[PDB]
Design a protein around this ligand. Sequence first.
Ligand SMILES: CC(C)N1CCN(c2ccc(/C(=C(/CCCO)c3ccccc3)c3cccc(O)c3)cc2)CC1
Length: 221
Amino acid sequence: NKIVSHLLVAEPEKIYAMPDPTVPDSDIKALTTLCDLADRELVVIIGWAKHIPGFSTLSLADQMSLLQSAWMEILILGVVYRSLSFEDELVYADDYIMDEDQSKLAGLLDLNNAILQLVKKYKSMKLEKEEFVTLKAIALANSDSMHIEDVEAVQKLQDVLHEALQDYEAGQHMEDPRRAGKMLMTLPLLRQTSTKAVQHFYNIKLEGKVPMHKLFLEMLE
Ligand SMILES: CC(C)N1CCN(c2ccc(/C(=C(/CCCO)c3ccccc3)c3cccc(O)c3)cc2)CC1
């Protein structure tokens, strides 16, 4: 329960979405709200990544290559998790919950129903925070960057969290021996949500004027 518990120990406190009650809800209102929210989560994810046992010792050039590859998947994974104790809604933040009608209004119904599949599949198999923490970290390790300096040391980080997930699953879950595989086999749908999400993010020109790669190196200092 070592890495799992240490992952568990390194979760960030809940950050809050804080929508304007002054502004009539709209397309522009929703995208503004979620934009500011993700910006704040990203600050917290650079912080949370630094606590991944092993992440700190790699290149700065490779620390970017992961976050730049994982950050949307990690955003989505958090939202997926908060969303289980609800029904057919997405909990971006405790104070911000979007349902089908609200997705259709932000121009995200397509993407959200996909993320709602991941909500469903996880709750269908009663996912545990220990499993969430360890999967969330796995997604950051296996983001498949195009350009890694130590293509060896990353596989180490993958192999460790991989072991952690088997050791834990073997341990607290002997009811199902083909269960980490099940857990690992959700990773694909989570890539497709992220891939579509990232594409939309560009199509409506949300990247701003400093490239994401530039912002990630700043924070990692
Ligand atoms: C200027 C730059 C530094 N910024 C800009 C904003 N950007 C951003 C905006 C929006 C998002 C999300 C979404 C979620 C839609 C899923 O249904 C999104 C994606 C594409 C288009 C419209 C909404 C998001 C995801 C999960 C959690 C969450 O809080 C926010 C992420 C990131 C981050 C960086």
